[PDB]
Design a binder for this molecule. Structure first.
Ligand SMILES: *[C@@H]1O[C@H](CO)[C@@H](O)[C@H](O)[C@H]1NC(C)=O
Lengths: 48, 49
């Protein structure tokens, strides 16, 4: 089972993580049934 | 394939369903037949398992 918990938070701090408490709600459970040992974030370029 | 041909030389549309039985997380389930809800009585309740 792949559990994804998530939370959206409106912040106004510039640089670092804000200090506070926010419990993450369960969003979606995924029936994947696969081995996972490595991950990589996906970003987006800006072209001009 | 002609309509005048006898049964046995006639086209048959064949659909074969294939499943795996309870070894991985499952995505396909059969329907759930929920009954009406009765309140204020001592009943045996079954809510989402
Ligand atoms: C999952 O992958 C890792 C590294 O590839 C491996 O060491 C581990 O044995 C694998 N687990 C299973 C259940 O195959």
């Amino acid at each position: 089972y792949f559990k994804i918990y998530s939370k959206h938070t409106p912040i106004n701090l510039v640089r670092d993580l804000p200090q506070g408490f926010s419990a993450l709600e369960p969003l979606v459970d995924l029936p994947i049934g696969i081995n996972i040992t490595r991950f990589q974030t996906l970003l987006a370029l800006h072209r001009s | 394939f002609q309509p005048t041909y006898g049964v046995g030389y006639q086209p048959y549309r064949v659909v074969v369903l294939s499943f795996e039985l309870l070894h991985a997380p499952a995505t396909v389930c059969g329907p759930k037949k929920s009954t009406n809800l009765v309140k204020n009585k001592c009943v045996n309740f079954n809510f989402n398992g």
